[PDB]
Amino acid sequence: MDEKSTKIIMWLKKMFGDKPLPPYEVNTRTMEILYQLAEWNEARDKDLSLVTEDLKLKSAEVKAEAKYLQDLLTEGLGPSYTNLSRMGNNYLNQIVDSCLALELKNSSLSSYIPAVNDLSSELVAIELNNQEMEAELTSLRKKLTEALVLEKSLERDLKKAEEQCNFEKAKV
Amino acid sequence: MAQTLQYVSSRLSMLQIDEEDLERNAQFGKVLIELCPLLGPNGGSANLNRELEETRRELLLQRKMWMRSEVIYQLVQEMLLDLQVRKLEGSLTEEERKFQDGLQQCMLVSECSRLLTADSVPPSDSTSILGLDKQDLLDLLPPNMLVLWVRDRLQKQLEEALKKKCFTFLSFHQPETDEEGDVLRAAKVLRLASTLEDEKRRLQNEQEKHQEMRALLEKQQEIYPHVLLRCLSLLRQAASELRLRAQSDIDRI
Amino acid sequence: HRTVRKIEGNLLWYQQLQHTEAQRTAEEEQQQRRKQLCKEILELRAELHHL
Amino acid sequence: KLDSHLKELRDFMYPEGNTLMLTTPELSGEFHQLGSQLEKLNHITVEILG
Amino acid sequence: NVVPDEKLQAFNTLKESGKPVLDEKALDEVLKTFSISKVPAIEEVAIEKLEEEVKALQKQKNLHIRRRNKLQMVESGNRQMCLKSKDKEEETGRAFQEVL
Amino acid sequence: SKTQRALQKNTNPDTDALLKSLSDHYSLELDEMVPKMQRLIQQCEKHQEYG
């Protein structure tokens, strides 16, 4: 308990920085909750750091490739490939924006088609699952309400029954 | 207190905190509220989450630039493949053939020039592959008049190809649009990216709703058995203490 | 205050319940159609899963 | 299981569905009948003594 | 502290309806289970909703059928293109042997 | 686990044991008490005739 306590205090000091640690009730339960939270935060912070560093690397690599392709196209097709008509540019932007929206690896149909299908399938699947859960919540709520009514009716009937028994006991 | 719990449970969805915990421990609840801003919705530190969002934006910008070029590159490759297939089927016009040969040659020279130019640093001393310089490849380009002609024709062909690709994207997402005219299809294409983003946003909202409903269901499943047990306890009392004992004695007397 | 909460709470609760029940009585008559639609929905979901 | 236990105990204690029954209905009926017959016997006795 | 005449009448009606009046403790328990959020009265999936669902699923079915057909076209087209690309590989392979 | 612990604390007597006790008691009343009462009713009728 003494080790978990030390970990929590160190973790709280890290989170609150230069601000005095607020006084809180130190009991077995508050310590367990704080401990789970501290473990969770530490594990997530580690994961997020690794993801952030990787994204930086990927940003550099994508930039390098973009330059490469731009240079390749300029040398091969001339500067004129960048002088598309207003509508041409609009079409290009829409393809680009659609691909970014679906987080695709490339602009090929082999990537676009499965992505659109997955998006549509996931949306339907979740909507059905939400309907089913809503029915279950309503059903359980009804069961719970009936049970609560029953509980109150039983309390009343039991009190009446106890009074009646006492009255009869006096008669006996 | 109920508000504090809702707030903490929404932000710290992993914490199993009951109302009894916050009632017995008021100062602890204050600590959790203060911790909530310091902890992102996913349990990570707020600073690190901010850094992550910034780094994601940067990547998205770079990716947008790369994709622009990538779309053109792929279209050109697809165009070349289509023209090649038509050339083998004997259906290509002499002008198309010249265009195809000229464009293929321009791209190839460019690709190979780059293979040679390891953008490396002039080292005045670096041995080229096969001893070839960029100039050796430029000599294999078609005549300058044909290159300019190919580049002018490519612009019109590229716009047509971009249009065809957009229509295909649209036709797959909204197959009902195939029965519509080119003008209406072009209007719908201009909204396609936004429609797809909306659908993605809808999915995210429905997932959040799902998580909320799930949390409520779990609460109800926790309360319901206890209520049944209280009812059972009352009935047991009526049966054991009143019917088998109190009333049975009365009936006998 | 206590009496007001009790009164309002019960009203609220049963209102919510009744609202839930009243919706049901109309529902018994419509049950055969509901079974048919549920059967149809199951059949369509199975077809959609195959597709 | 809890729901089944509750339903079984309740059915036993509420045979007519609306009232908690502590005495066996068959027995309750006999007590009433016996009380009525004793009241008649007491009248006849009083009448004869009178 | 004020209970309007309407709520009082409604509550009296509730008392008269023979429904058990839930005590404060019971109300607290049940109301907890109540998300403020307007969870729209589960409009009990009005036959209409099921009908709407059947319509929605039929629309989805039609959509999947159209998309499957399109995919089959794209797949046939790609298969043909892949065969022809193999022929190109053979032609380019001959040209490469000429250069050697 | 909380619900199981609550069931064990509240289980003296076992619901099944209690239902059995209730059923036995019911049978005992029909076999012994009900006939006794019928006999007494009959005896009272005879005493009336004696009157």
Report DSSP letters for chain B, one per residue: -HHHHHHHHHH-TT----HHHHHH-HHHHHHHHHHHHHB-TTSSBHHHHHHHHHHHHHHHHHHHHHHHHHHHHHHHHHHHHHHHHHHHTT---HHHHHHHHHHHHHHHHHHHHHHH-------TT---GGG--HHHHHTTSPPHHHHHHHHHHHHHHHHHHHHHHHHHHHHHH-GGGGGS-HHHHHHHHTTHHHHHHHHHHHHHHHHHHHHHHHHHHHHHHHHHHHHHHHHHHHHHHIIIIIIIIIIHHHHH-
What letter does residue D19 receive in the DSSP assignment? S
Gap from E75 CA to chain A (nearest CA, Å): 10
Q: Would you tell me the crossing angle of helices C31-50 and E47-99 to the nearest 10 degrees?
A: 10
Residue A124 Cα distances to A120, A161, B105, E45, angstroms: 6, 55, 49, 17
State which amino acid sits at residue A42.
E
Probe site for chain A from C12, C15, C17 (most A CB atoms < 10 A) = C17
Contact F19, D12 (CB under 8 A): yes
**Residues near B185 by beta carbon (within 8 Å), at least 6 away in sequence:** B167, B170, B177
Distance CA E25, CA E67 (A): 56
Residues of chain D neighbouring F50 (CB-CB closer than 8 A): none
Residue of D nearest to A164 (CA): D22
Residues of E at the C interface, defined by Cβ within 8 angstroms:
1-3, 7-8, 10-11, 14, 19, 21-24, 27, 30-31, 34, 41-44, 47, 50-51, 53-54, 57-58, 60-61, 64-65, 68
Neighbours of chain D (3+ CB pairs under 8 A): A, B, F
Contact B190, A95 (CB under 8 A): no
CB contact under 8 A, B175 and E81: no
Task: Compute how many other C-beta atoms are within 10 angstroms of the C-beta atom of residue E58.
Answer: 14
Residues of chain A neighbouring E42 (CB-CB closer than 8 A): 134-135, 138
Contact B74, A107 (CB under 8 A): yes
Three-class DSSP labels, chain E: CCCCHHHHHHHHHHHHCCCCCCCHHHHHHHHHCCCCCCCCCCCCCCHHHHHHHHHHHHHHHHHHHHHHHHHHHHHHHHHHHHHHHHHHHHHHHHHHHHHC
Gap from E19 CA to chain B (nearest CA, Å): 17
Beta bridge mates, E32: none
Residues of A at the C interface, defined by Cβ within 8 angstroms:
128, 138, 142, 145
State which amino acid sits at residue F10.
N
Burial class for D18, CB neighbours closer than 10 Å (0-12, 13-18, 19+): exposed
What distance, in Å, lies between the first and last C-alpha atoms of chain C?
60
CB contact under 8 A, D40 and F48: yes
Give the helix/strand (H/E) hosting D29. Answer: helix D25-49
Tokens for A43? 């594990």
Note whether C42 contacts A: Cβ–Cβ < 8 A: no
Tokens for B229? 């047990």
